[PDB]
């Protein structure tokens, strides 16, 4: 979530993802903690047995066979955390995650109901005013002349400066807004 | 692998600004600036029973007796069960009893 995906997944990353998915489906099958610990140690032993491969084409074939075995022996209902996608509490509070720009449309009486918070809100808005031009200049300067670029973004490079495109990250609504 | 230094510095600065923003999301103690209990059986439930039940019961009873019974077939009820040995209140005739019940094995 906080890091952008690359152009492709490396073999090492795919092996780690397969290992994590296999252990999650193993806990979904095993349920009991001692049973899962036993069979997860067995799975870790299998991965360590196939760890030291140098040809790397045999390693790719082994990865393909292993994930084929995983798709054959995957749980029909694997355990999903409630906040995870496909879970029960996933996107439950998007109806309550109101974006911050409605306070610009709030009435002066409602603004007067919260004076100090609103004063801090225009302090933050003034900081955004002052930092936007500098961070646009930084983004234009740090862009490579080549067509290669990723979705990663530079940090602030000197004192009194903010990271470019920081507003939508810093001022995002809370996952427990109420 | 781990974090590259650019994204590590970016996340540290972004998280510090997130700490500042979430601290600024707090409320001062004066915010928001807004412009006979007895016992539960004697006042909490009694007032509710005499206010939100008694007046509606009065209105429904008025409507039922003076705007439904005045009309022919609004309130139509089935005949009540009449058993042998019973006395009819409206007519005054007693229902004759049954036969001699030959089977009394149980």
């Amino acid at each position: 979530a906080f890091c952008a995906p690359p152009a492709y997944l490396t073999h090492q990353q795919k092996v780690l993802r397969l290992y994590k998915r296999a252990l999650r489906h193993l806990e979904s099958w095993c349920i009991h903690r001692d049973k899962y610990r036993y069979f997860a140690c067995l799975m870790r032993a299998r991965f360590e047995e196939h760890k030291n491969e140098k040809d790397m084409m045999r390693a790719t074939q082994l990865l393909r066979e292993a994930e084929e075995e995983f798709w054959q022996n995957q749980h029909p209902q694997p355990y999903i955390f409630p906040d995870s996608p496909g879970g029960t509490s996933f996107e439950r509070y998007e109806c309550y995650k109101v974006p911050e720009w409605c306070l610009d449309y709030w009435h002066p009486s409602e603004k007067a109901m919260y004076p100090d918070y609103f004063s801090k809100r225009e302090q933050w808005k003034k900081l955004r005013m002052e930092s936007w031009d500098r961070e646009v200049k930084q983004l234009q300067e740090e862009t490579s002349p080549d067509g290669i670029m990723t979705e990663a973004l530079p940090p602030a490079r000197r004192e009194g400066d903010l990271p470019p495109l920081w507003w939508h990250i810093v001022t995002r609504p809370r996952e427990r807004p109420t | 692998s781990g974090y590259t230094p650019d994204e590590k510095l970016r996340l540290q600065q972004l998280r510090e600004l997130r700490r500042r923003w979430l601290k600024d999301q707090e409320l001062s103690p004066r915010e928001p600036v807004l412009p006979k209990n007895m016992v539960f059986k004697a006042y909490r439930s009694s007032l509710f029973a005499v206010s939100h039940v008694l007046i509606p019961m009065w209105f429904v009873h008025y409507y039922v007796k003076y705007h439904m019974a005045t009309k022919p077939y609004t309130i139509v009820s089935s005949k009540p069960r009449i058993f042998p040995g019973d006395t009819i209140l409206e007519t005054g005739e007693v229902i004759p009893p049954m036969r001699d019940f030959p089977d009394q094995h149980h």
Binding site: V98, P99, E100, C102, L103, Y105, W106, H107, S109, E110, Y114, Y117, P173, R174, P177, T178 | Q25, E26, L27, P29
Partner: peptide
């Protein structure tokens, strides 16, 4: 205590 602001739309109108 430790209560936080709740962001809401303009219900005034």
């Amino acid at each position: 205590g430790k209560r936080l602001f709740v962001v809401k739309p303009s219900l005034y109108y």
